[PDB]
Amino acid sequence: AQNPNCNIMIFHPTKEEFNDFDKYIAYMESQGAHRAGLAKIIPPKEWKARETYDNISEILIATPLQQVASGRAGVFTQYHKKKKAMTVGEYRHLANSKKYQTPPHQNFEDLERKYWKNRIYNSPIYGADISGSLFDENTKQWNLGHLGTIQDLLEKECGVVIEGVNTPYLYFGMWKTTFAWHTEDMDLYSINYLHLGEPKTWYVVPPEHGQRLERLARELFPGSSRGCGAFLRHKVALISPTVLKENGIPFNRITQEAGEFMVTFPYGYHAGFNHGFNCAEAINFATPRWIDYGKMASQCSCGEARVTFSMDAFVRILQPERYDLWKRGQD
Numbered sequence: 001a002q003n004p005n006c007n008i009m010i011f012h013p014t015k016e017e018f019n020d021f022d023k024y025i026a027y028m029e030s031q032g033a034h035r036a037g038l039a040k041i042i043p044p045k046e047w048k049a050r051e052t053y054d055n056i057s058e059i060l061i062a063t064p065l066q067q068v069a070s071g072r073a074g075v076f077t078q079y080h081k082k083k084k085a086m087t088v089g090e091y092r093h094l095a096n097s098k099k100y101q102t103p104p105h106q107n108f109e110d111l112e113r114k115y116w117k118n119r120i121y122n123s124p125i126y127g128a129d130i131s132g133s134l135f136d137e138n139t140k141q142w143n144l145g146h147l148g149t150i151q152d153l154l155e156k157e158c159g160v161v162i163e164g165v166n167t168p169y170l171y172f173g174m175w176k177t178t179f180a181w182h183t184e185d186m187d188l189y190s191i192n193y194l195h196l197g198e199p200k201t202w203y204v205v206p207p208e209h210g211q212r213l214e215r216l217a218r219e220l221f222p223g224s225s226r227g228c229g230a231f232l233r234h235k236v237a238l239i240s241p242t243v244l245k246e247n248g249i250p251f252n253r254i255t256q257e258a259g260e261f262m263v264t265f266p267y268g269y270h271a272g273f274n275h276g277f278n279c280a281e282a283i284n285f286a287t288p289r290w291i292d293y294g295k296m297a298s299q300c301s302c303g304e305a306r307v308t309f310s311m312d313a314f315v316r317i318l319q320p321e322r323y324d325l326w327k328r329g330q331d
């Protein structure tokens with residue numbers, strides 16, 4: 001068995017190997033990358049996402065989200081308070097202000113220490129979940145707006161044609177902006193490209209150990225667990241690495257820098273934080289290996305998780321028994 005300790009693997013494809021996205025994902029899996037839940041892909045030196053980032057300031061962040069924490073420093077939830085619209089240039093200036101800017105630090109480990117000590121005492125503002133793309137249309141390799149769609153994969157594997165579309169999303173971050181512990185919708189893959197700015201630190205639980213994280217979360221968030229049998233789908237709970245280690249939960253960590261891709265694998269729980277002003281692009285995708293994970297994915301039906309249009313068909317076809325209850329949650 002390849003990668004039996006479930007380490008995060010880092011890949012350096014050549015420009016030739018960067019042509020065929022599906023083939024490269026399957027290669028990485030042949031080497032055991034999926035066992036970690038997360039892999040890094042450093043693009044060949046010949047590649048670029050676009051020519052420059054000098055002209056992005058007028059992108060609008062219609063609904064910036066202030067991430068307000070409750071709990072203790074290593075075990076907390078966050079809620080998203082909606083703020084007034086602002087441009088990317090306005091958000092960048094805000095990120096760099098004395099109130100929000102990255103503190104002085106020695107290295108990524110020192111900054112990570114400071115994040116976990118102090119996150120809860122601040123409420124950073126995240127420009128998350130913005131439909132759009134920063135890939136040039138002429139970028140032919142690993143262009144996250146030109147991937148094969150999940151609806152087409154389902155149709156190719158299973159023969160059933162379904163409605164829905166699959167487009168990318170932009171994330172503009174600042175120091176301390178946080179992504180809570182989650183798997184993707186329908187336990188899909190994700191791919192995330194850090195276009196510019198400061199790093200993103202990731203934590204990940206191997207898919208084979210995801211239920212250990214779920215059991216800890218039920219213990220640590222006992223009201224939420226009574227409310228919903230899949231409350232991590234709400235994407236609000238944070239647990240620090242120190243607390244994970246105290247509770248014996250297997251996990252790994254890695255820091256993504258600008259110009260690098262991360263892939264999350266089906267049922268790989270992940271969480272993390274941004275180091276300072278940055279911009280990432282991410283999208284979900286599927287492969288043949290995903291289908292069995294999609295059929296088994298948990299679902300929130302309490303009403304909180306509320307998701308895209310395109311998840312309907314995935315539930316309907318892969319999980320027909322659960323469909324009626326889940327759809328009630330959506331309505």
Ligand SMILES: O=C(O)CNC(=O)C(=O)O
Nearest residue numbers: 171179190191192280282
């Ligand atoms: O970058 C972020 O805030 C969150 N990203 C992801 O969870 C992802 O790409 O799957």
Ligand SMILES: [Mg+2]
Nearest residue numbers: 056057058059
């Ligand atoms: Mg612009």
Ligand code: NI
Nearest residue numbers: 183184190264
């Ligand atoms: Ni994710």
Ligand SMILES: [Zn+2]
Nearest residue numbers: 228300302304
């Ligand atoms: Zn729920």
